[PDB]
Amino acid sequence: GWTDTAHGSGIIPMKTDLELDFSLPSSASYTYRRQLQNPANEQEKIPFHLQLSKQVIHAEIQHLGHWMDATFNLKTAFHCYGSCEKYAYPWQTAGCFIEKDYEYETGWGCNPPDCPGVGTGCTACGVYLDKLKSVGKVFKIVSLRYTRKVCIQLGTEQTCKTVDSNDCLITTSVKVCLIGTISKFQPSDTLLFLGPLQQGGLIFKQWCTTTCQFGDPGDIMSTPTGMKCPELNGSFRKKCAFATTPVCQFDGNTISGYKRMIATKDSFQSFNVTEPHISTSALEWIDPDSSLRDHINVIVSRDLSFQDLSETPCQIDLATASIDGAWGSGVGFNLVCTVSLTECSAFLTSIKACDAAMCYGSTTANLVRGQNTIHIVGKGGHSGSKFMCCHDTKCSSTGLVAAAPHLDRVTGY
Amino acid sequence: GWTDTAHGSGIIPMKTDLELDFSLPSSASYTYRRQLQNPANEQEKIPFHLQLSKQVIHAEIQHLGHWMDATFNLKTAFHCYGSCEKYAYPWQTAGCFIEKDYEYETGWGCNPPDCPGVGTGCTACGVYLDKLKSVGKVFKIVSLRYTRKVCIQLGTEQTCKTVDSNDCLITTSVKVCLIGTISKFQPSDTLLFLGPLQQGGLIFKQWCTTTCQFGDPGDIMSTPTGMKCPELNGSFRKKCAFATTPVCQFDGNTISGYKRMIATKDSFQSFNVTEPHISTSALEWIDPDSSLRDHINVIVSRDLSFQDLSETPCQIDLATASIDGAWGSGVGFNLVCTVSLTECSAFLTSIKACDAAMCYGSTTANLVRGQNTIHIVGKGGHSGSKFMCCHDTKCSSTGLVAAAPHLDRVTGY
Amino acid sequence: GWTDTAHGSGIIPMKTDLELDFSLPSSASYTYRRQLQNPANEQEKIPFHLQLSKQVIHAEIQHLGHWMDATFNLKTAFHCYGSCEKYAYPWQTAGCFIEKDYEYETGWGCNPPDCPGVGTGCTACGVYLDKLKSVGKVFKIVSLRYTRKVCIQLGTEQTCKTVDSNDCLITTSVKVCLIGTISKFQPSDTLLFLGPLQQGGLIFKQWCTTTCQFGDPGDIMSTPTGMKCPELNGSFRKKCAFATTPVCQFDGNTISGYKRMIATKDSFQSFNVTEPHISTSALEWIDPDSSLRDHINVIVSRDLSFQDLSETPCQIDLATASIDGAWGSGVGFNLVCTVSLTECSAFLTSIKACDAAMCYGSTTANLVRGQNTIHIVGKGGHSGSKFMCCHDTKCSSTGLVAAAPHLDRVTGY
Ligand SMILES: *[C@@H]1O[C@H](CO)[C@@H](O[C@@H]2O[C@H](CO)[C@@H](O[C@@H]3O[C@H](CO)[C@@H](O)[C@H](O)[C@@H]3O)[C@H](O)[C@H]2NC(C)=O)[C@H](O)[C@H]1NC(C)=O
Ligand SMILES: *[C@@H]1O[C@H](CO)[C@@H](O[C@@H]2O[C@H](CO)[C@@H](O[C@@H]3O[C@H](CO)[C@@H](O)[C@H](O)[C@@H]3O)[C@H](O)[C@H]2NC(C)=O)[C@H](O)[C@H]1NC(C)=O
């Protein structure tokens, strides 16, 4: 029952030369040098060197756009004759507006002196948002990954590798394992940056999604493809009589999402960020908070009894078959892989979906000799990303683009 | 100060034969054979065998029922005389409806030609939902548990045991410890399955609970005991005049929860599932995602210095005393246990609430010699479950049924 | 590249005397005695003693106040002349109320017999909440910390220290490391206590924040500084005619947050609490749930090869420079520290913000020889707290008070 998925080693403890074991803050790097006694010869020694980089957070993100503050406005129009489609209105120039029409409701005692209409015209009323101000950048977390660069040297062996926070690196005589605490961040958290990235942000758990009303977090969003307006929500009413022009009233919410947030600002969680790097579909940074600690173990054994537990005679070859689903998505894309197994009856291994740069997901494949169809869910990437089936570092040269994510609001009156 | 709650071992490292140490994906199993040198005799060797099953997720769940898509409909009725209770209406046959009556509001200029009424009758108006379509199955997570079957053999010792993700298994000469990363799932997450279980689902963090409006996630739920309708929310209005029958208008939301979800579908998180098994109150599966890795440590020491740290002279006997609270609940049930302690002045131990199959919770009991009353919160089970006080595998033969969970909506106009 | 942030040790495994390794419930303490063979002399032995306390949870909190149940009431007033400011109304004495006025709308067929007014007066209508009952205490989690007291003795060495759940304690010959599972609690969770603390509580993920409507969790909050009333939300309407006094109607929600919670109570998560201790800005307790297990490792090596990995020649001195931001906040306060580095070219270390009792946060500082300006985010504390820049246990004697947190609702009609 072969697998290459166990990353570590089998050891005889009497034939081990060195063990490091400690907790380290994610934001801390660490360096260790020591001359170790040669187990082959007690009168000799060999250099051992360890280097650990600071832990980098990698979030695949959705660029939700800029959060807008706004002012609420209510205006009443009146035409004694003609329907509401015939007339342009002041509010129709605005970035976001709702209109409620009262066509054919002229009667008597709802009219100014100059209107003798009865059951005609249009008393159109508009609520609208102006004084639109960008207050911050908004990203929704699609997925999370935490990595350290690990460099080992034992005499003439030397290898650097990037290692996930609950993975191990294995060389001929050295194993390094990371064990990784709780995350401050979660998939689907929304991050709000009110200024530059370096100045940190706020985490939100309830950013508007399926139903964005004016007053919610993320109510008014501006993307480069255009505005995303919230629904208003509240009832309209004419006050009619005193031989005057009708005066509309709105009972719904008047105060914007941003203003409502700022008033109770200290109800939310902050985070800070050093060395931020933004890409099309990702945000990378180091969290300077030193209260988050990982566990590191290092073990040296320059002996033939040291087993790499990943070693197998099994050989695989990959071909990217087909794709469906979307890029930049927490639901994601479905990549189909044709996977040949040779030299083995069966093999349990990890098959990954990757582009040129990064991998966006991985499935545990239960392979039997010959061809195998394996499905992978990937989460992330952008318009142009060409996703390939991969194992270790070998990828299929066939790469497939995904479809755009469905992230649309539906604003039904 | 005796306790049996430390699961592991005390070791002299020079008298250890083997150490395995590695990271493994939850979805991966693993097998290891090796002939180890006999520490008693250097010219002999003994077989060591390790088998780890894939990690199974066990969620106690609530069957919230099926999520329904629907079409919104508004219809106006009119009777010139008689009150609204006297008449049956078209909308009253429908699965979900709200009605707003305007009794005794006939006046003049709110009537058709055939109605000379003044301050009489009934202008009943109905909003209602039809074209009800099941779109998926819905489960709310009550609790979570992650387990692997661990099998050890060292020569003539052999034991298999199911082990939680941050527990250890201990035999005469072998200890296996699991250390378990972050969970993709949380208690109170709601899982939506749009097709068969095997095709995966969506996680939701904001499924409607205390106030379900039409348009929310989970707005229209169908259980076998009947429909659960959302509230509508929006104002009504007659438009009256032109010597016609009154025409009602509704300003509230027209689009269903499902349709609003699907439009922005890629805002949410997917998960997938292999080997799903559904029961009355639980869902078990293996997550094929290979990016989630646990840490495994194995240590062999066939020596008398190897201590089982759980060993104590303390002896306990249990009796299930009484119960209150509910089954199938995140709040849960309160089981009272009478626990006798003998052979010891004091004893710290774990007392568990279990039925025939599984345990639903466990309390740390601080026992003193003689009788002790211990309370346990259990979370899960179903109508028929008979919960018993247990320690190790010994249970009280008395089992007690809990009461039904309160999971009702209250829809006040 | 010096750092003091690696908490643990470098070891030669053949020169180790003892290793303990096991899982332990958070609610369990543990004691271990053993006479170990003296490595210096095989015919002698030395006493080794380990004591671990139960794990204590420390939450910095916000006292949100008491959650109130209430009864909804709608009353209509009428004055044939004079505006609504001129008259006191029955509802104006109540703890929470909204009022909707219809000034100058007398007309004809909206009046009792005693009112011949036309376009005058005031038909004021009030919705209001009475029968206010406290149902529980409410705390919002600002931050979380999990600690155990660890006591070691190896012969003549003895040290007790409080250790975070993913930190290690290091002495001359002994290292103890804690590795800490998932948390049941998260920052920004709101905890509701319906009775005394000892009887446990409910966790909520959606407690009202930026927009509190009547019917929401936390809709009606009572603090010592006064009531916090929700918004109502729903439309008003006069029914007019039949030569009577106007009768107002409200279409919005009638049922309170509490009642709506209790109806579906078993949708939520409970927790329980032993040995609770409440302070101005914090809640400390031990969770009696025994299903949460940490990993403990202990390693003894009474040998000169045992390295304390935190040892450096680097020397620091601190001065608290300035502060901005707030106490009792998840966003928190920004403390500026002047940090002198001597004896070293560069130094990576942790700089903490603390008052007399506890530390409220810590930053990873990348120091170079001489003066360094370092920023720290602290989360927690109260009005009087005087926050100091600290490293190890040495603090600057200058302490600085923060500003009050902004936690206000804005209720715009
Ligand atoms: C790490 O990140 C936090 C959170 O972003 C930092 O606090 C932030 O500081 C900004 C400074 O602009 C504050 O936002 C606003 O500042 C203006 C003045 O520029 C002020 O008038 C407004 O009232 C508002 O507070 C805010 O305190 C805070 N950001 C947010 C989103 O609340 C913290 O200083 C950073 N720590 C570092 C660099 O060490
Ligand atoms: C693992 O689970 C995910 C999530 O459930 C799988 O993607 C799902 O595939 C279904 C297929 O029915 C998709 O739902 C709908 O499919 C119809 C066609 O049958 C389509 O017209 C609709 O627009 C809709 O997308 C959907 O992509 C997705 N499910 C959800 C709830 O979004 C994924 O394929 C699974 N991976 C495996 C088996 O490896």
Ligand SMILES: *[C@@H]1O[C@H](CO)[C@@H](O[C@@H]2O[C@H](CO)[C@@H](O[C@@H]3O[C@H](CO)[C@@H](O)[C@H](O)[C@@H]3O)[C@H](O)[C@H]2NC(C)=O)[C@H](O)[C@H]1NC(C)=O
């Ligand atoms: C640990 O904590 C849980 C949760 O707080 C405990 O259950 C709680 O017990 C209280 C007892 O007051 C219950 O609340 C109410 O009790 C009255 C009677 O006093 C009852 O008429 C109401 O219907 C309501 O249930 C409730 O079951 C529960 N608390 C909540 C907030 O739901 C559990 O007993 C505790 N376990 C221990 C001490 O071992």
